[model samples]
Target chain A: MKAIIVKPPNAGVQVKDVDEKKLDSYGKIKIRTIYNGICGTDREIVNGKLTLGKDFLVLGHEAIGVVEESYHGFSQGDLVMPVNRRGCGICRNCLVGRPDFCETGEFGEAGIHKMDGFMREWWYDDPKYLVKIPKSIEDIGILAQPLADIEKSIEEILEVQKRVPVWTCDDGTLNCRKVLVVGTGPIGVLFTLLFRTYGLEVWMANRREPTEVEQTVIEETKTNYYNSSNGYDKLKDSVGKFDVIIDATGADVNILGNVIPLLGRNGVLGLFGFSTSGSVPLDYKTLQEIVHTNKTIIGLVNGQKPHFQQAVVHLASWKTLYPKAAKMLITKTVSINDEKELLKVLREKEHGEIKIRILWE
Target chain B: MKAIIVKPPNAGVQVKDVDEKKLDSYGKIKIRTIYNGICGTDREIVNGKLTLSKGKDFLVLGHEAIGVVEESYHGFSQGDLVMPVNRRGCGICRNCLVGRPDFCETGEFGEAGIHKMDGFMREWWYDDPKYLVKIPKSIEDIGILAQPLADIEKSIEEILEVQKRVPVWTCDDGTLNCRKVLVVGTGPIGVLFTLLFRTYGLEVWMANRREPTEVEQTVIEETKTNYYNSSNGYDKLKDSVGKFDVIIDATGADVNILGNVIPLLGRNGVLGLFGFSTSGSVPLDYKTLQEIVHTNKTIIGLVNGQKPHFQQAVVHLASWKTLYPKAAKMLITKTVSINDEKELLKVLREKEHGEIKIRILWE
Candidate 1:
């Protein structure tokens, strides 16, 4: 099988051949990879910055595929997205179809953790972990996995914010609620778009000005952008406090400490990235403020099948509602046969890139 | 009228006579102070450690009080027992605009005893009916505890809601028997928390530096709640005590204490921080951070309660008085007459050996 593989502790990726003939395919549906999206996790693993359980790992978790054959509820011509996480059977949450909340640390994420991912030519997975995507989003269905994660985070935020007696405005809308996304990457822009779509006052921020692509998406979504290099305090002064602060920066603990103070009363600070950094200094005064004002800090990760299902609906709607922003999400696309560009794009994001997709067809 | 007045920058409270007849009283219900319960905030004001707004030379003390309506107003009549909501909303934020000043965003909200407003330690006070929650006369004897208990009720309620993120929080038997709760303090707040969680059928444990006082032990035994004496050190609980599904710090200790206990939290656990300490930073290692994210944990901070919480507190007091009467009555360990200024100062200045809740009688 032809695939992009990484043997960790080594700093680069290799396009090579692997033997998949001996692998079991009993009761699992086969999927032919169509499009695979590159994210920071893949780049980090390629750069030897992250650890995985497997020696030879295929590196693609955000992907869309065509069903290789029809089995049970699936059809051969259907467009589908494979769920990233394959759960540890022992956890209650996992047994109930919510591997995203697996209590045991023993869950395997395809292409990223302990299991083989969809980055290969063709792969077999359980029917339960594959979500059907609307064919209308065939060009961008590869984004379903990451968008599913954003869906779950927003869902959890809404669920937890129910602690507040009344979080909605007097007119029964979230327009009064403000949200600040801490990065302007594809995930952050998606977060801003989702929050804006929910009628929330949206803001996107990064240390540098947004790329032209990011600017287009921000403008189309009517979201505010702040170059936070001035100082977080300046951002605070201009925006006051946000009801929700979503951090897509993931690995930067310094960013976490800096933005935590920007949460308003009964505010939720949602952390969605994975960080392996050593230790970060968190002041007690800020913690005490969290106590006095009833704040919540939550860490979220990958989503389940239903979230992916919901993501498809949302993606279909956005394609119609904000066509330009939706189109700008995938700024660059390259064929897998272009090994040089494939390896280059895998290692670095281009100047105005939001999402770089590799065609596996 | 008589009142306990504290002048900022001064270290003691004065039991002084005050003129209240001329104060603006339009559209307000008159509440005669019956019993005022004292907490750490009262002591902080007495020690000049906390600040208040200036130009009000002296401020009346006490935010936790069970009072009697002395005059009729819209929705409140004479002889009715009432407890006033402590914090007044800033009227700007959506939360405050919806009448939940406890979730005030601007910090412009005024807490009756602790912030810009005068409290209920005086002979009589007048407040709009919007801030006063009527307490049934049946449980009036134990009603003074409602004000403090309201904050606990709100925190516990919110944390339980947050715990719903985990599917297995409740046992198959429809009780929270699967969950364990650890409350890190045996003060009034801790005891109240213990009683409340126990009411919900959770396995509750209270921890402190010393052994529980006789009354506390009796209450714990009556309610089937456990106690952990951490005088030897909290590290001892690592193996024997096990992890808790819900952990609350009510001691107001430095953040390190809470940080140290983070390891004792079970998978899918929620840590509700109600204690406030203006201390320095604590080094947060990657291990704890990794554990938090990996195990789907939540750390929530809680403070003031809203009006519904107060109403629920009264209902809780009524239930406890009926079901756990002895435990309910034992909460107020001592009562001192407001006329005895020296005795009042002594109780306020130094916590007595076995004091749980000390009430100042205004009659």
Candidate 2:
């Protein structure tokens, strides 16, 4: 089978042939990869920003697939996304079906690091681990995995909001706490999508202005967009109040720490970004403000199979709610017709790209 | 009427016959001051560390007091011993309107002895029935403690409310399992924390720079707590018993003590800062700040107590007297007559090696 390999990554991505018989292929479902998504993780691997598995590692984690054959549960032609977090199989949380909350650091997440990824031509999996996607979202199914993480972030947001009396207003509606997503990446757009479904107007701002395509998605999703070229100073007064600040500032961790004073009393600051080398300064004033206002900040990461399942189920509703915006998120689709095209997609940042997916034949 | 008058801080208190004519005299009842307890605030005044009130040129030296109603009043009559609330509310804020001038909005409120009003360290005073908190006669011996205890009560109220952020799972008993609590500097206030959190079924540990005296050991043992000393310094406390879910700093606000222990919280931990450090400086470390964000931590600062808390304090004092008989009484190291200025001065300097509460009685 043909697979893209990432080995010690300075030499760039390459196509290679791997023995199909040597995979962790024991399962009840036979699946074929139909489409693979290019995300920040893939770019990190391509640029040597990530450490790799010892051998030549196949390089995709986010995928939409078809079950070529299945007898236990899923039917043929059923769409699926592979479960990324392979548990250590012994931790207290991992043993009982939650690997995302793995107690020990011995777990493996596919593609980006320790385990074999899904970008290869064919793979096998247990039906339980692969989430089922309805056909209503087949056209834009490639966004499911990313949306799964965004869904997890949203769920955890609701869980943390349980700290105070944020249940709802007298009309049984979300009084809609003011929300600010700190980046205009696809993750930020997905965050806006979920909030806008409730008809809420969320503010999505970044130091750099979004591309033309990103601006279109913002308009379609009804999010207030700001070109924060002047840094957080320009954000003052115009942004009103941000009761909930979501940091998707993937590289600058300072943005996560710096925007804290701008949050209102009892506000929630959710940090979903991770930077390899980032520092946040803290002194007496920062510590004092954190306690005086009773603010909360949480660093959140990977969701479990259940969260992936929620994304799968909601993909259809998300598309139906904002079809134009949903379609715009899948900004580019490149065919893996030749090895050259795959190299170009991974090596260079595409212009006007909110998201891109690779098609497999 | 004889009253202990503080003309200026560090000038020493004077026993003088003040005009019994001027108190909050416009009220419906007349009160004869009975017993008043001397605390840290009193020491600060007599040590030249604090300023005196402007108009009176003197401030009363006590707020922890017991008064007897000498005239017919709204709820009490002749020979009724009553507790006077130390604070006068601003009558606007919810906290102040409900008699919690401790959190008064305008900050123009009055605290007896400590602020603009004449305190209970005098012979006789007049007050409205509204400011008097009724106490059971059974607990009159320890009623003086209700005021100091009231300060701690308010802090714990805010501290307990912060715990609602991280709900424990149903895996263990509803009690906080694997949860630990530690209190630093077992002064009078810190000892109260040890007893209060222990009564709430927490494994409370009290620590200071030295081993406890036999008398303090008696009371601490009675409360079912362990004592830790700085035999190994801060490292011993940090390395020996592991991290804590709740760590309360009751030592005189040493910012160094607060910062050294910043990394000592278990996930979802809370810190109760009860001490006042006027010039505390902390060289901040972002690693612990990151830990704070990651682990969902909190530290709160609270100063004075409210009226509702005074009533709560009285209830607890009464109940603990029955359950742990010597606990409340053990807090008082000496009881002196108000007229004995020498005895008051001697106990104020404290000759013992444990937490002390001095009483001034009308003998």
Please compute DockQ, using alpha carbons, for every candidate against the native two-chain complex. 0.02, 0.01
For the predicted complex of model 2, DockQ is 0.01
Interface root mean square deviation of every model, in Å?
A: 18.6, 22.3
Error of 2 at B68 (Å): 1.5
Which candidate leads in DockQ? 1
In terms of docking quality, how is candidate 2 classified?
A: incorrect
The reply for model 1, stretches above 4 Å from the true place, is A1-361, B21-27, B52-54, B280-282
Q: Could you report the Cα RMSD, in angstroms, for every candidate shown?
A: 19.6, 21.4
> Which has the greatest TM-score?
1
Q: Per-residue lDDT of A1-361 in model 2, one digit per residue for the tens?
A: 8887777556478777887765556366878888988887788788887554145777888888899975665779888888787677778777656666779977887776567789888788876567766555677777778877787788787778778654443212342457888886678888877766543458888777776656776766557777666666666676656778888756555664567767877877888886678567766776677798778888877776666655654555444345567667887778777677778887766765667888888
Sequence-dependent TM-score of model 2? 0.50
List runs of model 2 lying over 4 Å from the truth. Answer: A1-361, B8-10, B51-54, B169-171, B253-255, B280-282, B348-352
Per-residue lDDT of A301-345 in model 1, one digit per residue for the tens? 777776776576567556644678878788788998899999999
